[PDB]
């Protein structure tokens with residue numbers, strides 16, 4: 014009889030099945046069936062907001078860290094200060110992860126940390142070696158990054174399976190939330206930001222001089238032919254598929270690709286591909302105002318309209334606790350959200366992962382604002398049109414400025430309600 | 431003794447629904463059929479990488495428009511034997527039989543799995559409140575534009591969202607449907623995606639009639655009938671926007687009827703309780719909708735060809751044909767199964783079946799996968815002309831000239 018409904022995004026090679034295995038010990042102890050529904054990231058904002066506005070939906074949903082404020086501000090999440098206390102309270106979490114548990118300025122936590130992830134560059138070891146590129150120099154600075162992409166463009170290296178050259182850099186130009194998360198380090202590296210506090214409200218800083226310098230440098234990589242035209246119409250899954258297929262020398266992603274590299278295609282990885290045997294990781298290069306990468310992850314939230322709140326909170330404590338934290342990070346290739354869980358050998362013994370753990374020092378998060386879901390939709394949409402300027406041969410500083418002005422007007426409307 | 435099959439997301443729980451479909455075959459033969467689900471956006475990359483590498487599943491789902499392109503690479507096992515075991519050419523609609531091969535090829539290289547074609551879902555409640563007659567809105571282009579204008583002016587608000595509905599939502603980016611949704615407007619104007627000229631196939635997207643059809647469609651967004659936000663979204667996002675009650679009208683296949691009668695499906699939503707279907711309107715020169723579906727193909731590097739062929743006969747066979755169509759909401763590929771009472775009884779589905787009369791598809795060419803990538807990319811930039819307020823006849827012509835140059839290259843080679 015007793016059931017729970019949980020919504021997750023595709024975090025692991027076999028999302029529903031892996032989640033079912035993760036919760037099996039809880040299901041057997043409590044005599045509960047946890048039903049899981051997988052929502053792709055592209056529809057997850059629409060589906061979660063429609064649950065919020067309708068009052069009908071699951072007991073628990075996965076919430077991207079950048080959406081916790083936005084859904085909390087709709088008044089639909091259960092406070093979970095009790096669960097967080099039971100898991101060790103504020104000390105049990107990195108400060109950046111603890112801020113993701115609530116809407117900025119709220120007294121009560123409305124989400125439990127589930128997993129963490131941050132961005133770095135995967136590269137083809139074989140492709141950089143053949144081009145004569147030193148990883149240490151290419152990922153040190155913006156100048157080094159561009160110097161390496163130039164050598165990768167000139168290289169006569171061809172993928173062993175494709176028999177064709179690799180694009181130096183692939184990056185998604187449409188649909189994905191990653192259209193923003195992939196731009197943010199460039200913006201931040203130049204001394205810009207997505208938003209700023211002015212007149213005791215938040216507003217867009219995407220049309221600030223330093224935000225435009227960072228974004229213009231990133232887009233100019235495609236204008237200089239380091240990113241293929243075709244990339245600029247693709248989403249995150251398509252660029253990941255292009256790297257697996259041996260079409261791209263370099264791309265930005267999270268630590269999950271290390272796990273996908275070790276698993277056959279049948280089970281949702283790319284162990285059969287050349288890229289899997291030729292996998293390097295390097296941090297984002299320092300920009301003129303320092304080194305930054307996107308730090309995020311996902312939390313778990315309980316709808317305050319749930320019929321099963323005590324049992325749902327027992328599942329939250331289980332999923333946020335040390336055993337399930339290590340197990341899900343092993344299955345997904347994410348990092349645990351719980352600080353303690355980072356010391357497991359699965360994480361400390363993993364050399365590509367150690368690059369991500371070290372890169373966390375330069376990790377940066379968006380403020381946890383009401384309206385952030387709106388900011389991300391509008392940013393993805395307007396940055397997507399910035400990539401179109403490149404494809405159309407219309408990228409100039411003034412055209413980017415006029416487009417980020419439009420972006421900033423729409424974003425400011427979403428932040429003011 | 432094992433088979434690997436790659437499928438696309440055809441049903442609400444793709445792997446689980448597939449595993450239940452094959453469980454009776456697994457028990458008859460003592461075999462495990464392992465299934466891997468590939469999203470449509472990555473399925474062309476993954477299938478072509480299998481073809482070029484010599485490494486992949488035993489069977490793959492192949493969208494009908496890709497059968498020629500994968501067949502041309504010489505990687506598919508001939509399956510005329512399976513098709514004979516299922517009754518041969520007479521056991522299939524001619525349009526479905528076309529998709530079993532590269533155009534002009536001697537041997538069949540794919541087995542028909544399911545069929546789908548496009549029509550318009552609409553909110554019965556939204557059109558009633560706007561004073562729009564569905565039969566008149568979906569009869570002609572003038573009716574279609576007149577109806578969208580009434581839907582734009584309407585004061586109707588979704589009961590759950592308490593907000594107005596977009597008249598029309600259509601995906602502007604990423605999905606293959608960016609082409610399949612443009613094609614009926616192109617075709618209705620007397621145009622086409624490609625034509626045979628000078629001994630070759632080439633793009634006809636810059637032909638005068640193709641530009642009139644395409645400009646009419648795009649001008650629906652220029653007139654405020656499609657929200658700017660839609661023009662940056664993909665098929666799943668538009669489907670989610672309709673389910674959430676944000677769109678009065680959208681183009682889709684028969685699978686949404688099945689999604690509409692299943693819980694979180696979207697049975698609980700206002701859109702499911704107020705759901706109509708109407709065929710594509712007649713255009714000036716003709717009345718057309720996209721007709722497609724998916725076949726199953728066997729890689730000639732499979733180590734299990736005899737067992738794989740037994741799975742193909744099972745999946746293409748009457749029992750599995752009906753059961754998979756019931757689980758997915760697609761139409762059976764097998765001629766027989768269109769007449770099964772389960773399909774006949776369903777009034778929204780009867781609309782799809784009878785709309786098959788106007789069904790058209792692309793010729794089965796080598797390089798069609800590349801044509802679809804390039805078409806989606808260039809049409810995506812046509813939608814951007816609208817979002818940027820730069821849509822003119824000349825800017826569209828310039829863009830489809832570029833599209834045609836890139837497409838003509840893709841019809842020659844990768």
Ligand SMILES: OC[C@H]1O[C@@H](O[C@H]2[C@H](O)[C@@H](O)[C@H](O[C@H]3[C@H](O)[C@@H](O)[C@H](O[C@H]4[C@H](O)[C@@H](O)[C@H](O)O[C@@H]4CO)O[C@@H]3CO)O[C@@H]2CO)[C@H](O)[C@@H](O)[C@@H]1O
Pocket residue numbers: 022023024025026027028054076077078079080130189190191249250251253254267269281308309310311389467472
């Ligand atoms: O802004 C929202 C939220 O973003 C979180 O970051 C997400 C990215 O949004 C997401 O794109 C990223 O990558 C996903 C990707 O979208 C999926 O397409 C992909 O699917 C894989 C999957 O791994 C397998 O099941 C399947 O078989 O293969 C496909 C590839 O075709 O999976 C990846 C990884 O999940 O994931 C990011 C992290 O979840 C931020 O973390 C958060 O802070 C933001 O709030």
Ligand SMILES: OC[C@H]1O[C@@H](O[C@H]2[C@H](O)[C@@H](O)[C@H](O[C@H]3[C@H](O)[C@@H](O)[C@H](O[C@H]4[C@H](O)[C@@H](O)[C@H](O)O[C@@H]4CO)O[C@@H]3CO)O[C@@H]2CO)[C@H](O)[C@@H](O)[C@@H]1O
Pocket residue numbers: 051056438439440441442443444470492493494495496546605606607665666667669670683685721722723724802
């Ligand atoms: O051109 C290639 C090929 O296309 C075939 O048509 C496909 C369309 O490409 C496809 O977009 C269409 O819609 C899919 C949609 O893309 C998926 O995103 C969606 O996924 C569902 C899923 O089934 C559920 O499990 C999940 O919970 O929700 C998502 C929605 O968020 O499913 C629909 C329907 O499968 O489907 C078309 C039919 O397969 C043509 O048929 C073919 O001829 C062409 O060769």
Ligand SMILES: O=S([O-])[O-]
Pocket residue numbers: 464
């Ligand atoms: O690979 S699973 O079917 O055992």
Ligand SMILES: O=S([O-])[O-]
Pocket residue numbers: 255474475476478803
């Ligand atoms: O179209 S390429 O990305 O497979």
Ligand SMILES: [Cl-]
Pocket residue numbers: 206207208378379380
């Ligand atoms: Cl910021």
Ligand SMILES: [Cl-]
Pocket residue numbers: 419420423
């Ligand atoms: Cl705008």
Ligand SMILES: [Cl-]
Pocket residue numbers: 622623624791792793
């Ligand atoms: Cl055509």
Ligand SMILES: [Cl-]
Pocket residue numbers: 821822823824
């Ligand atoms: Cl004009």
Ligand SMILES: [Cl-]
Pocket residue numbers: 834835838839
């Ligand atoms: Cl030409």
